[PDB]
Amino acid sequence: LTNLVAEPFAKLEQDFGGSIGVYAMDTGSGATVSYRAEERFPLCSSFKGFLAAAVLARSQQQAGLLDTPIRYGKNALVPWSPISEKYLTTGMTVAELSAAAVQYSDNAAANLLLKELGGPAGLTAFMRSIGDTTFRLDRWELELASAIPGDARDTSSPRAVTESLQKLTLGSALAAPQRQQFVDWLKGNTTGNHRIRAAVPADWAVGDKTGTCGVYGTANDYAVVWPTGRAPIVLAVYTRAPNKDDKHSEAVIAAAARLALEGLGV
Numbered sequence: 001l002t003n004l005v006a007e008p009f010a011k012l013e014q015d016f017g018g019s020i021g022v023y024a025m026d027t028g029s030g031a032t033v034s035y036r037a038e039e040r041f042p043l044c045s046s047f048k049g050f051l052a053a054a055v056l057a058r059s060q061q062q063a064g065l066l067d068t069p070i071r072y073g074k075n076a077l078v079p080w081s082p083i084s085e086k087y088l089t090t091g092m093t094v095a096e097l098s099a100a101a102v103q104y105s106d107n108a109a110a111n112l113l114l115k116e117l118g119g120p121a122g123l124t125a126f127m128r129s130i131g132d133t134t135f136r137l138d139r140w141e142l143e144l145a146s147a148i149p150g151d152a153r154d155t156s157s158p159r160a161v162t163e164s165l166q167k168l169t170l171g172s173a174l175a176a177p178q179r180q181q182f183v184d185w186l187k188g189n190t191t192g193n194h195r196i197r198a199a200v201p202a203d204w205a206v207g208d209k210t211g212t213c214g215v216y217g218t219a220n221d222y223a224v225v226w227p228t229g230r231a232p233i234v235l236a237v238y239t240r241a242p243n244k245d246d247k248h249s250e251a252v253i254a255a256a257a258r259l260a261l262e263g264l265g266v
């Protein structure tokens, strides 16, 4: 199936001027499409989806974790925190911080949740616990977004991202109530309208999480998509480029997603 689209993926990344990694799986048939899917790509803000999943996991053991109010000072605010800066004088709940991290990629919210989890190693440990041996988070916002060529810090692979997303949203990695909360947060994402969501028909349900390091042409998107009356598809699209000033392209991510779905037979 990978062969059907191997040549157009190569042509897409040559027009982009960088590297594109794609993994997609039809949960109905088990068919997969794989292009650079085991290479490492920077996570950028896309780690925040797994962060929310790790918070939900903890909430299974800790009653009421999601409703805990978190107060923070202005020193907790980091650039591009569009939600948490509006509640600085009041605070927010863990559930609100998690939704802000997922749906608005709120940086301060992400750092606040990371600290509750034990930092980047705490999130890495969560991914190890669901069977993901590729994921690694090493730094906090905004330092994790340096996207340096060859640097394995703060990276995963498109295949590992897709397999983990599948376990968390469709498998048994989360208990049923927590699993549906994770899916609903992904479905309410506001930052991905020009990436995987631009690639699917209007009647499909989509939950996604985007990432944008910006430098080194580095950006990404991962998603669970539900074709109407049909089994869900899970996919991840990651990009990078050789030069620090290379620009990222949402259009390229959408185009890669389109090819992956075409390769799956949709």
Ligand SMILES: CC1(C)S[C@H]([C@H](NC(=O)[C@H](N)c2ccccc2)C(=O)O)N[C@H]1C(=O)O
Residues within 6 Å of the ligand: 043, 044, 045, 046, 080, 104, 105, 106, 107, 141, 142, 144, 145, 191, 210, 211, 212, 213, 214, 215
């Ligand atoms: C929330 C952010 C605006 S900053 C955060 C971070 N990226 C950066 O710090 C980049 N230097 C940046 C890219 C675009 C706009 C502003 C900053 C990351 O990928 O984790 N992701 C960006 C995003 O996902 O939109």
